[PDB]
Amino acid sequence: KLVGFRFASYINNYMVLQKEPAGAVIWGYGTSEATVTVTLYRDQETIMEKVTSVKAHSNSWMVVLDPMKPGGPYEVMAQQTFGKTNFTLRVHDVLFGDVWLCSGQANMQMTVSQIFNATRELANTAAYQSVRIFSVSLIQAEQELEDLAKVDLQWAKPTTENLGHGIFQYMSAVCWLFGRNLYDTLQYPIGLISSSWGGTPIEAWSSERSLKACGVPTQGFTQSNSVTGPSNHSVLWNAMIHPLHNMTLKGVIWYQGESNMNFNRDLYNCTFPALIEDWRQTFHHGSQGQTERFFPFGFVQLSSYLSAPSDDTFPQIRWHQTADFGYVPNLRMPNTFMAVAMDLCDRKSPFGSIHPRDKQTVAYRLHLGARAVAYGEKVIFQGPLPEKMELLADKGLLNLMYSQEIQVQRQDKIFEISCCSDHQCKWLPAPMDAFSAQTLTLSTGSCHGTLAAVRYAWATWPCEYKQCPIYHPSSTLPAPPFIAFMT
Ligand SMILES: *[C@@H]1O[C@H](CO)[C@@H](O[C@@H]2O[C@H](CO)[C@@H](O)[C@H](O)[C@H]2NC(C)=O)[C@H](O)[C@H]1NC(C)=O
Ligand SMILES: *[C@@H]1O[C@H](CO)[C@@H](O[C@@H]2O[C@H](CO)[C@@H](O)[C@H](O)[C@H]2NC(C)=O)[C@H](O)[C@H]1NC(C)=O
Numbered sequence: 001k002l003v004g005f006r007f008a009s010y011i012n013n014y015m016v017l018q019k020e021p022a023g024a025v026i027w028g029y030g031t032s033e034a035t036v037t038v039t040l041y042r043d044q045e046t047i048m049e050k051v052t053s054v055k056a057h058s059n060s061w062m063v064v065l066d067p068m069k070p071g072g073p074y075e076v077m078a079q080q081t082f083g084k085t086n087f088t089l090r091v092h093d094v095l096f097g098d099v100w101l102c103s104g105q106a107n108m109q110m111t112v113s114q115i116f117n118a119t120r121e122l123a124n125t126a127a128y129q130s131v132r133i134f135s136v137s138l139i140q141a142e143q144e145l146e147d148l149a150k151v152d153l154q155w156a157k158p159t160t161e162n163l164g165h166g167i168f169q170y171m172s173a174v175c176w177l178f179g180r181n182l183y184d185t186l187q188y189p190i191g192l193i194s195s196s197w198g199g200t201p202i203e204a205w206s207s208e209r210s211l212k213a214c215g216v217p218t219q220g221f222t223q224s225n226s227v228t229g230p231s232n233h234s235v236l237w238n239a240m241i242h243p244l245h246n247m248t249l250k251g252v253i254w255y256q257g258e259s260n261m262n263f264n265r266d267l268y269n270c271t272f273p274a275l276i277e278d279w280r281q282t283f284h285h286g287s288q289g290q291t292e293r294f295f296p297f298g299f300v301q302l303s304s305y306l307s308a309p310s311d312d313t314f315p316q317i318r319w320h321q322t323a324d325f326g327y328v329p330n331l332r333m334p335n336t337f338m339a340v341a342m343d344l345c346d347r348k349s350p351f352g353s354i355h356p357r358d359k360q361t362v363a364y365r366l367h368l369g370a371r372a373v374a375y376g377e378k379v380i381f382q383g384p385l386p387e388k389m390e391l392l393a394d395k396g397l398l399n400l401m402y403s404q405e406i407q408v409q410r411q412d413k414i415f416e417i418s419c420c421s422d423h424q425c426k427w428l429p430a431p432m433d434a435f436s437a438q439t440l441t442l443s444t445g446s447c448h449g450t451l452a453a454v455r456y457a458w459a460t461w462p463c464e465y466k467q468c469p470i471y472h473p474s475s476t477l478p479a480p481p482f483i484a485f486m487t
């Protein structure tokens with residue numbers, strides 16, 4: 001921070017810069033009015049050169065490289081010329097590829113040394129040396145920071161030691177496994193930046209713009225059993241996300257929401273879509289338009305934990321994570337994709353059931369959505385959801401017609417119906433009565449009243465591991481939870 005001429009903190013040896021059609025932003029600090037020349041080299045050969053100057057009343061400089069085909073290695077040099085003085089900066093083993101930012105709370109923070117099969121996962125790096133990794137230090141700030149205050153893991157080739165460095169240290173398992181899966185598909189460099197902090201609500205990760213857009217109340221005394229990390233508005237946006245916003249990138253994956261179970265829960269269907277839109281706007285502008293204005297944003301629908309049976313804050317958050325549609329992308333969440341995780345539970349996790357150890361399936365399901373939404377591939381990435389319902393009240397039956405094929409295991413409490421009688425509505429279990437390839441028939445005979453709604457898997461812990469009642473027969477994806485109201 002005392003060195004006058006330097007790169008921004010996202011720039012280092014071994015990094016990945018965003019590939020074509022975007023141009024990669026390179027920025028740093030230097031002496032006011034100095035000229036800065038940025039050169040991309042392949043050893044001694046000049047690939048491209050960009051020239052700029054440090055603005056007269058600020059001490060930063062920025063260039064945008066021409067778009068690059070993925071691959072490498074390259075070296076980036078920056079030279080500051082100021083009068084008769086010459087200072088140079090150099091980073092090597094630079095690759096061009098897709099840069100993904102991974103963020104959220106503790107289930108993004110959980111590292112490869114904490115997951116199932118860790119020994120073998122930590123050893124599987126030789127084929128993935130072009131999946132480069134980076135982890136942001138846990139820092140909060142009361143104002144937006146221009147540059148990261150601290151980096152835990154600077155850009156690196158993956159090794160046993162840095163993938164599994166410590167419990168909730170680095171490297172994020174969901175992030176790593178997502179990138180590894182993407183590398184299998186894309187076969188060009190992937191950069192992974194993890195920026196997460198356990199026990200944090202979405203308000204900490206939101207700029208003031210998205211909070212204002214949602215009418216979020218002014219902060220009071222926020223800390224509780226479920227909010228254990230920084231909870232002041234925007235303090236993690238300020239320090240751990242905003243400093244990256246000028247860096248060109250491909251997309252974001254996100255795993256957060258547990259700490260909103262009792263913190264502006266009823267606003268999460270606003271604050272999460274608003275965060276996505278605000279990060280998009282801010283990163284698009286910061287990167288001089290190079291990051292896509294609607295860059296793909298993927299997220300994990302909350303998994304389960306062993307809660308009180310009556311607690312339905314997690315089901316509410318899961319619904320709000322989809323802006324109350326049940327699926328993404330949707331009208332309020334364009335170019336988003338979701339991994340369902342409620343069936344990826346872990347009764348015996350040494351980190352608590354709130355921190356389940358199967359991150360492999362989470363990253364697999366995320367990478368399906370990325371392939372479809374971020375890369376345009378015709379790959380199934382959504383689980384079966386009803387597209388219409390037919391109530392046969394005289395027969396005591398409710399037909400659910402699904403838009404995909406279903407594989408169904410008998411489970412007479414996973415569906416519930418809202419039965420309104422005697423001036424009250426109660427949720428009653430709805431047994432499964434009959435099955436066809438895309439139609440499930442529920443029995444409603446226990447409802448001696450009017451049927452107002454139906455819901456599925458509306459519980460904090462709806463099933464045992466990979467034993468939810470409804471899956472697609474071959475995509476491996478579970479039916480997502482939902483609620484649907486009768487006309
Ligand atoms: C444990 O981790 C290892 C390493 O990732 C897995 O073995 C790899 O499995 C993939 C399939 O996902 C193969 O494509 C690779 O060739 C394997 N690599 C190595 C080095 O063996 C193994 O499948 C994992 N097992 C469990 C139960 O998670
Ligand atoms: C990172 O992006 C921000 C925008 O989000 C840049 O700030 C803008 O800079 C332009 C050009 O100097 C000004 O006209 C705008 O008023 C600035 N906007 C804001 C909101 O500050 C910022 O300069 C970028 N960082 C670097 C190093 O260039």
Ligand SMILES: *[C@@H]1O[C@H](CO)[C@@H](O)[C@H](O)[C@H]1NC(C)=O
Nearest residue numbers: 140142219230231232233235
């Ligand atoms: C959060 O803001 C409150 C109220 O302004 C203040 O007491 C404190 O400085 C902040 N907390 C932390 C941990 O920074």
Ligand SMILES: *[C@@H]1O[C@H](CO)[C@@H](O)[C@H](O)[C@H]1NC(C)=O
Nearest residue numbers: 266267268269270320323324
């Ligand atoms: C968010 O959910 C709450 C609680 O169900 C509801 O009252 C509100 O209308 C929802 N808002 C949006 C924008 O979906």
